[PDB]
Amino acid sequence: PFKEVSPNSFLLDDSHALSQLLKKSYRWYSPVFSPRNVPRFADVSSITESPETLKAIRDFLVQRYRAMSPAPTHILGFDARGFLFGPMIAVELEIPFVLMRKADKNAGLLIRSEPYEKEYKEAAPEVMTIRYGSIGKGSRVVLIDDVLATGGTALSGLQLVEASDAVVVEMVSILSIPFLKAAEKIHSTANSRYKDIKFISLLSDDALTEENCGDSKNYTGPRVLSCGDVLAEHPH
Amino acid sequence: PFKEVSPNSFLLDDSHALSQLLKKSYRWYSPVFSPRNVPRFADVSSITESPETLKAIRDFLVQRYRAMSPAPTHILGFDARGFLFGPMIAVELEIPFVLMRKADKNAGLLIRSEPYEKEYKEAAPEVMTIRYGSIGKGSRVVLIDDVLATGGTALSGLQLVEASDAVVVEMVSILSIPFLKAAEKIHSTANSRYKDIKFISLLSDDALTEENCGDSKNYTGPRVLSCGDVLAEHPH
Numbered sequence A, B: 001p002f003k004e005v006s007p008n009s010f011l012l013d014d015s016h017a018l019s020q021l022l023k024k025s026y027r028w029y030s031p032v033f034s035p036r037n038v039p040r041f042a043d044v045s046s047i048t049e050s051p052e053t054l055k056a057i058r059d060f061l062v063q064r065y066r067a068m069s070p071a072p073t074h075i076l077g078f079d080a081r082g083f084l085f086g087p088m089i090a091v092e093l094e095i096p097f098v099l100m101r102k103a104d105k106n107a108g109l110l111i112r113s114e115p116y117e118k119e120y121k122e123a124a125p126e127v128m129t130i131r132y133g134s135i136g137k138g139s140r141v142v143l144i145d146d147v148l149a150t151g152g153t154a155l156s157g158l159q160l161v162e163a164s165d166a167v168v169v170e171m172v173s174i175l176s177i178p179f180l181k182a183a184e185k186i187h188s189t190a191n192s193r194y195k196d197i198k199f200i201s202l203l204s205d206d207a208l209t210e211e212n213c214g215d216s217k218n219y220t221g222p223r224v225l226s227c228g229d230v231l232a233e234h235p236h
């Protein structure tokens, strides 16, 4: 079950089969082996390429929401890694899966989020959107993405569900980076207006060790190879 | 069943329940109501927000590959709309779901595609990637995305599977735009080297009429509204 690690922020107990499987399957990469500049980039492919792990996530979340009452009415996944988990849950629960994307990616009349100023060190916040009317008054929305880091995207989700006159069931993430204090910051910002927002995570990045490092050991070549160069490595 | 509309290009017969449902659920948008400059932008949300339609797609493709022999070993979905359909099929078939994305989005050692020169009128081609070793020698990969238009992305998929010493089972798309002749062009380019590549589509855009137009009738406001402006339209 989920244990409260901090106010309205829950983590699956590490004895659960799902937590074990995620700990076993997850692979992280350092800067020279990833597309982002963070110490450890958690690769979502290490999860989607794992049939046993993907099904365990689907089974668990589907059982969670089917047992939930009042039951959720919508699943809102974040572009693009949230798209990998949302649909398989929504197809089982038989409720709509809504897409949160930048305006230049979404169709129809849209509603845009209002991110906070970037607190130095750059890292400009993303303005996200959902189609106007995709989520109606009285809807109970489950927000989903792969990794909860600073919480900037989660906040965009909250604002959009709020603006739609709907309520957030909870923000769910496969992995959370508790060091960046997303739940805490979101829970106290703007005079605790989002204090009631529940955050659930299936695994903490603190559970990831060097054993989860996907970096190529003793490698000195480039990170990216063309098709032609790879084709030359084998008979064809 | 699938009917051959042209060499190695199949379309689901329009009497099938799935084809009917897609025809009923699909919504398209003109430029002032979409993020792209094409006459009719097929909104994938009109499908994902439709529980009945999403499940029908999942059921059909899952039954197709379970009855297939030799059975597929991998599903390669295109960033980001291919991510919406691939995982729910892969979780059922119990095979890995690999991600095709730009290098600045993928982790690990990557293999990049080699797109052709843009044939005037601009529209610069995208260099796509998959992690080196995500698909091995002897793999049988199903490529998937929502809309098959010019085929530039599909070709990136073919090149990557080819470079990995694996074979393409088929390129599957929810919707195809037969006017842009993707299957034809891919089938004859480079001395018909991709002539054997099968293309399957669940619906042709020719089946979409004005009844599928999602444009707001007699609307004159902006396409995008902020959260604050929408919040002001209702008591809170």
Ligand SMILES: Nc1ncnc2c1ncn2[C@@H]1O[C@H](COP(=O)(O)O)[C@@H](O)[C@H]1O
Pocket: A038, A040, A041, A042, A043, A078, A081, A145, A146, A147, A148, A149, A150, A151, A152, A153, A154, A182
């Ligand atoms: N260490 C990380 N590994 C993988 N993805 C990350 C990492 N840190 C941030 N991201 C992601 O970037 C998105 C934005 O994070 P956030 O700062 O919580 O808005 C998240 O959904 C994750 O996909």
Ligand SMILES: Nc1ncnc2c1ncn2[C@@H]1O[C@H](COP(=O)(O)O)[C@@H](O)[C@H]1O
Pocket: B038, B040, B041, B042, B043, B078, B081, B145, B146, B147, B148, B149, B150, B151, B152, B153, B154, B182
């Ligand atoms: N009319 C359209 N509606 C929606 N998406 C489109 C349309 N035309 C092209 N696209 C997309 O842009 C991607 C690239 O198309 P392609 O030209 O086939 O490489 C496709 O996967 C579709 O998602």
Ligand SMILES: [Mg+2]
Pocket: A078, A079, A080, A145, A153
């Ligand atoms: Mg995100």
Ligand SMILES: [Mg+2]
Pocket: B078, B079, B080, B145, B153
């Ligand atoms: Mg694409």
